[PDB]
Design an enzyme around this catalytic site. Structure first.
Site, PDB file in Angstrom:
ATOM      1  N   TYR A  86      -6.225   4.384  13.104  1.00 47.49           N
ATOM      2  CA  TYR A  86      -4.787   4.492  12.402  1.00 47.49           C
ATOM      3  C   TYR A  86      -4.635   3.193  11.856  1.00 47.49           C
ATOM      4  O   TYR A  86      -4.520   2.279  12.581  1.00 47.49           O
ATOM      5  CB  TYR A  86      -3.750   5.223  13.018  1.00 47.49           C
ATOM      6  CG  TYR A  86      -4.071   6.582  13.689  1.00 47.49           C
ATOM      7  CD1 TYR A  86      -3.691   7.428  12.641  1.00 47.49           C
ATOM      8  CD2 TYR A  86      -4.793   6.960  14.675  1.00 47.49           C
ATOM      9  CE1 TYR A  86      -4.398   8.861  12.706  1.00 47.49           C
ATOM     10  CE2 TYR A  86      -5.195   8.182  14.999  1.00 47.49           C
ATOM     11  CZ  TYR A  86      -4.758   9.202  14.109  1.00 47.49           C
ATOM     12  OH  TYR A  86      -5.089  10.801  14.449  1.00 47.49           O
ATOM     13  N   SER A  87      -4.484   3.064  10.499  1.00 45.72           N
ATOM     14  CA  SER A  87      -3.877   1.769   9.606  1.00 45.72           C
ATOM     15  C   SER A  87      -2.647   1.594  10.324  1.00 45.72           C
ATOM     16  O   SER A  87      -1.750   2.364  10.322  1.00 45.72           O
ATOM     17  CB  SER A  87      -3.697   2.025   8.279  1.00 45.72           C
ATOM     18  OG  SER A  87      -4.865   2.346   7.530  1.00 45.72           O
ATOM     19  N   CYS A 267      -5.659   2.500  -0.444  1.00 46.19           N
ATOM     20  CA  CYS A 267      -5.663   3.277   0.916  1.00 46.19           C
ATOM     21  C   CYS A 267      -5.084   4.557   0.805  1.00 46.19           C
ATOM     22  O   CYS A 267      -4.196   4.735   0.022  1.00 46.19           O
ATOM     23  CB  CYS A 267      -4.887   2.175   1.753  1.00 46.19           C
ATOM     24  SG  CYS A 267      -4.940   2.565   3.572  1.00 46.19           S
ATOM     25  N   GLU A 307      -9.914   0.730   1.606  1.00 49.29           N
ATOM     26  CA  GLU A 307      -9.807   1.401   2.791  1.00 49.29           C
ATOM     27  C   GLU A 307      -9.531   2.804   2.660  1.00 49.29           C
ATOM     28  O   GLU A 307      -8.188   3.094   2.755  1.00 49.29           O
ATOM     29  CB  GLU A 307      -9.260   0.494   4.023  1.00 49.29           C
ATOM     30  CG  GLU A 307      -9.543   1.161   5.420  1.00 49.29           C
ATOM     31  CD  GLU A 307      -9.565   0.184   6.327  1.00 49.29           C
ATOM     32  OE1 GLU A 307      -8.433  -0.389   6.827  1.00 49.29           O
ATOM     33  OE2 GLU A 307     -10.796   0.107   6.981  1.00 49.29           O
ATOM     34  N   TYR A 309     -10.471   7.126   3.682  1.00 47.94           N
ATOM     35  CA  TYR A 309     -10.921   7.801   4.919  1.00 47.94           C
ATOM     36  C   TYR A 309     -10.748   9.448   4.654  1.00 47.94           C
ATOM     37  O   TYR A 309     -10.196   9.891   3.756  1.00 47.94           O
ATOM     38  CB  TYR A 309     -10.239   7.400   6.030  1.00 47.94           C
ATOM     39  CG  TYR A 309      -8.641   7.282   6.034  1.00 47.94           C
ATOM     40  CD1 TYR A 309      -7.656   8.382   5.855  1.00 47.94           C
ATOM     41  CD2 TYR A 309      -8.156   6.185   5.694  1.00 47.94           C
ATOM     42  CE1 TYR A 309      -6.454   8.055   6.042  1.00 47.94           C
ATOM     43  CE2 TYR A 309      -6.925   5.961   5.646  1.00 47.94           C
ATOM     44  CZ  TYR A 309      -5.794   6.858   5.558  1.00 47.94           C
ATOM     45  OH  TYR A 309      -4.465   6.835   5.745  1.00 47.94           O
TER      46      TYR A 309
HETATM   47  C1  LIG Z   1      -9.911   3.188   8.794  1.00 50.72           C
HETATM   48  C2  LIG Z   1      -8.800   4.411   8.836  1.00 50.72           C
HETATM   49  C3  LIG Z   1      -7.699   4.344   8.967  1.00 50.72           C
HETATM   50  C4  LIG Z   1      -6.867   5.700   8.935  1.00 50.72           C
HETATM   51  N1  LIG Z   1      -5.295   5.562   9.038  1.00 50.72           N
HETATM   52  C5  LIG Z   1      -4.786   6.730   9.083  1.00 50.72           C
HETATM   53  C6  LIG Z   1      -3.343   6.631   8.932  1.00 50.72           C
HETATM   54  O1  LIG Z   1      -2.951   5.814   8.751  1.00 50.72           O
HETATM   55  N2  LIG Z   1      -2.919   7.779   9.012  1.00 50.72           N
HETATM   56  C7  LIG Z   1      -3.658   9.124   9.363  1.00 50.72           C
HETATM   57  O2  LIG Z   1      -2.872  10.121   9.364  1.00 50.72           O
HETATM   58  N3  LIG Z   1      -4.814   9.131   9.533  1.00 50.72           N
HETATM   59  C8  LIG Z   1      -5.402   8.025   9.164  1.00 50.72           C
HETATM   60  N4  LIG Z   1      -6.974   7.981   9.300  1.00 50.72           N
HETATM   61  C9  LIG Z   1      -7.528   9.233   9.644  1.00 50.72           C
HETATM   62  C10 LIG Z   1      -7.565   9.172  11.135  1.00 50.72           C
HETATM   63  O3  LIG Z   1      -8.357   8.340  11.659  1.00 50.72           O
HETATM   64  C11 LIG Z   1      -7.931  10.811  11.616  1.00 50.72           C
HETATM   65  O4  LIG Z   1      -9.168  11.089  11.087  1.00 50.72           O
HETATM   66  C12 LIG Z   1      -7.207  11.913  11.263  1.00 50.72           C
HETATM   67  O5  LIG Z   1      -5.680  11.734  11.805  1.00 50.72           O
HETATM   68  C13 LIG Z   1      -7.442  13.397  11.785  1.00 50.72           C
HETATM   69  O6  LIG Z   1      -7.800  13.156  13.313  1.00 50.72           O
HETATM   70  P1  LIG Z   1      -7.522  14.547  14.257  1.00 50.72           P
HETATM   71  O7  LIG Z   1      -7.934  13.904  15.569  1.00 50.72           O
HETATM   72  O8  LIG Z   1      -6.206  14.840  14.216  1.00 50.72           O
HETATM   73  O9  LIG Z   1      -8.452  15.500  13.504  1.00 50.72           O
HETATM   74  P2  LIG Z   1      -9.977  16.256  14.064  1.00 50.72           P
HETATM   75  O10 LIG Z   1      -9.591  16.799  15.489  1.00 50.72           O
HETATM   76  O11 LIG Z   1     -10.980  15.073  14.331  1.00 50.72           O
HETATM   77  O12 LIG Z   1     -10.353  17.285  13.207  1.00 50.72           O
HETATM   78  C14 LIG Z   1     -10.669  16.786  11.903  1.00 50.72           C
HETATM   79  C15 LIG Z   1     -10.030  18.047  10.831  1.00 50.72           C
HETATM   80  O13 LIG Z   1     -10.998  19.120  11.102  1.00 50.72           O
HETATM   81  C16 LIG Z   1     -10.247  20.173  11.249  1.00 50.72           C
HETATM   82  N5  LIG Z   1     -10.721  21.247  12.094  1.00 50.72           N
HETATM   83  C17 LIG Z   1     -11.259  21.179  13.355  1.00 50.72           C
HETATM   84  N6  LIG Z   1     -11.810  22.264  13.864  1.00 50.72           N
HETATM   85  C18 LIG Z   1     -11.853  22.923  12.731  1.00 50.72           C
HETATM   86  C19 LIG Z   1     -12.384  24.210  12.375  1.00 50.72           C
HETATM   87  N7  LIG Z   1     -13.294  24.940  13.366  1.00 50.72           N
HETATM   88  N8  LIG Z   1     -12.370  24.816  11.195  1.00 50.72           N
HETATM   89  C20 LIG Z   1     -11.934  23.902  10.307  1.00 50.72           C
HETATM   90  N9  LIG Z   1     -11.199  22.879  10.338  1.00 50.72           N
HETATM   91  C21 LIG Z   1     -11.361  22.481  11.346  1.00 50.72           C
HETATM   92  C22 LIG Z   1      -8.746  19.608  11.698  1.00 50.72           C
HETATM   93  O14 LIG Z   1      -7.970  20.617  11.372  1.00 50.72           O
HETATM   94  C23 LIG Z   1      -8.718  18.342  10.986  1.00 50.72           C
HETATM   95  O15 LIG Z   1      -8.287  18.931   9.790  1.00 50.72           O
HETATM   96  C24 LIG Z   1      -7.815   6.720   9.308  1.00 50.72           C
HETATM   97  C25 LIG Z   1      -9.096   6.856   9.368  1.00 50.72           C
HETATM   98  C26 LIG Z   1      -9.499   5.478   9.187  1.00 50.72           C
HETATM   99  C27 LIG Z   1     -11.146   5.561   9.336  1.00 50.72           C
END
Ligand SMILES: Cc1cc2nc3c(=O)[nH]c(=O)nc-3n(C[C@H](O)[C@H](O)[C@H](O)COP(=O)(O)OP(=O)(O)OC[C@H]3O[C@@H](n4cnc5c(N)ncnc54)[C@H](O)[C@@H]3O)c2cc1C
Length: 309
Positions: A86-87, A267, A307, A309
Site C-alpha cells: 500500500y502506498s 499513480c 507506480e 498496480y
Molecule cells: C506499489 C503498490 C501500491 C499499492 N497501493 C495501493 C493503495 O494505496 N491502495 C489500495 O487500495 N491498493 C493499493 N495497491 C493494491 C494492493 O497492494 C492490493 O493488491 C489490493 O488492496 C487488493 O488486495 P486484497 O488482499 O484485498 O485482494 P486479494 O485477496 O489479493 O484479491 C485480489 C482480487 O481478486 C478478487 N477475487 C478473489 N477471489 C476471487 C474469485 N474467486 N473470483 C473473482 N474475483 C476474486 C478480489 O475480489 C480482489 O478484487 C497497491 C499495489 C502496489 C503494487
C-alpha cells in the site's frame, strides 16, 4: 503558517529505509483509527487507516508499506498470507506530526456476480477488507517499507511536480503535498509548482478534497488542483471524463512545463495508463511533436515516474 513536526532527526538519513522488516518477522503495529473517505454515492468504500509503528518502521514519502493479512495462504498450507503493498499516504512525520504513525488509503475490493450482483465473502479482497474492517487497538503485521520509484526529487526545491492520480493513487501525493506545504521542514522549503490532477468516479468519491482545496488558498502561486469525475462528467468527445481529459485542457501549459524540466508522476490502478498515453500521443501530434520521442526524452532525463498496480 506551517505545522511543527518532530523529530527532526528523521531528516538525517541520506538513503530511504528499505526492507527494515521482512515477511518472516513483521513488525506488529497497532491501528489508531479507520475512517471512510467517501460519501454515500461513491461506488465503493475507500478508507483512511492510521497505523502506530512506534517509530520502528520509518519511511520516506512515496514509499509503500507491506501488510500481511491474517490466516493461512490458500495456495500454500501452513504458510502465512502473501504481503499486499500500500502506498503510504502520510509524510514521514505522519498524521500526528510525531514520527510514530503512518497512514494508508485503501479501496475495499468487493466481489459482485457480474449478472446477479450477489456477493461472496470467499471472493472479497482479503487485505483491503481486513484493513477497512479494522478498529482502534487491532494489530497489523507490517513489512517494509519498500519502493523507490515514487521518492520525491528534492535536489531542486523550486522544481515543478505534476501529479496524476486516479483513486487510491492519490496516496503518495497527499504525502508530497503535506511536506511541500503543510509541515515545518526547515531543510526543504518548496518554492516551485505542484500541480495535482485527480480522477475519481464522482464528487462523493473524492479523497482528501478539503485538504487539497485549502492549499489553493494558502499557496495560490505554488499549487494547482484539477479534478475529473468519470460518471458525473464527460470529455469534449463525450466519453466519460478521465484524468487524461483534464490534462488535455492544459495541453500547452503542461507540455511547456515538461520541456522546462518538470517531473510528472502517475499513480493508481494500472488501467488508467492506456487512456493517458492515448491522450498524450494526440496532444503531441496536434503540436507537431512525436510523443514517442518526447517520452523517451522524459525517461532519459528521469522526469517520468509511474507506480501503477
Ligand atoms: C506499489 C503498490 C501500491 C499499492 N497501493 C495501493 C493503495 O494505496 N491502495 C489500495 O487500495 N491498493 C493499493 N495497491 C493494491 C494492493 O497492494 C492490493 O493488491 C489490493 O488492496 C487488493 O488486495 P486484497 O488482499 O484485498 O485482494 P486479494 O485477496 O489479493 O484479491 C485480489 C482480487 O481478486 C478478487 N477475487 C478473489 N477471489 C476471487 C474469485 N474467486 N473470483 C473473482 N474475483 C476474486 C478480489 O475480489 C480482489 O478484487 C497497491 C499495489 C502496489 C503494487
Amino acid at each position: 503558517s506551517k505545522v511543527s513536526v518532530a523529530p527532526l532527526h528523521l531528516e538525517s538519513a541520506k538513503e530511504p529505509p528499505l526492507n527494515t522488516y521482512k515477511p518472516k518477522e513483521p513488525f506488529t503495529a497497532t491501528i489508531v483509527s479507520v475512517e471512510s473517505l467517501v460519501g454515500p454515492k461513491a461506488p465503493g468504500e475507500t478508507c483512511h487507516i492510521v497505523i502506530d509503528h512506534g517509530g520502528n518502521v520509518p519511511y520516506w514519502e512515496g514509499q509503500s508499506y507491506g501488510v500481511i493479512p491474517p490466516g493461512e495462504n490458500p495456495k500454500k498450507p501452513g504458510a502465512p498470507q502473501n504481503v499486499r503493498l500500500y502506498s503510504i499516504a502520510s509524510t514521514r512525520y505522519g498524521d500526528n506530526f510525531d514520527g510514530r504513525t503512518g497512514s494508508l488509503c485503501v479501496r475495499r475490493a468487493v466481489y459482485y456476480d457480474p449478472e446477479t450482483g450477489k456477493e461472496d465473502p470467499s471472493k472479497n479482497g482479503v487485505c483491503s477488507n481486513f484493513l477497512c474492517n479494522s478498529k482502534p487497538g487491532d494489530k497489523i503485521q507490517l513489512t517494509g517499507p519498500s519502493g523507490k520509484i515514487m521518492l520525491l526529487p528534492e535536489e531542486d526545491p523550486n522544481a515543478t511536480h505534476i501529479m496524476i492520480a486516479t483513486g487510491t493513487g492519490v496516496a503518495p501525493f497527499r504525502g508530497y503535498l503535506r511536506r511541500m506545504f503543510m509541515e515545518d521542514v526547515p531543510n526543504y522549503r518548496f518554492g516551485g509548482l505542484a500541480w495535482l490532477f485527480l480522477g475519481v468516479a464522482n464528487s462523493d468519491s473524492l479523497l482528501y478534497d478539503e485538504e487539497f482545496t485549502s492549499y489553493l488558498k494558502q499557496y495560490p502561486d505554488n499549487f494547482r488542483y484539477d479534478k475529473a469525475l468519470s460518471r458525473e462528467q464527460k470529455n469534449r468527445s463525450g466519453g466519460k471524463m478521465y484524468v487524461q481529459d483534464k490534462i488535455e485542457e492544459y495541453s500547452d501549459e503542461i507540455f511547456k512545463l515538461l520541456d522546462g524540466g518538470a517531473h510528472i508522476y502517475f499513480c493508481g490502478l494500472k488501467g488508467m495508463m492506456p487512456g493517458i498515453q492515448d491522450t498524450l500521443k494526440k496532444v503531441a501530434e496536434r503540436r507537431g511533436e512525436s510523443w514517442d520521442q518526447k517520452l523517451a526524452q522524459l525517461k532519459k532525463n528521469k522526469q517520468w515516474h509511474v507506480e501503477v498496480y
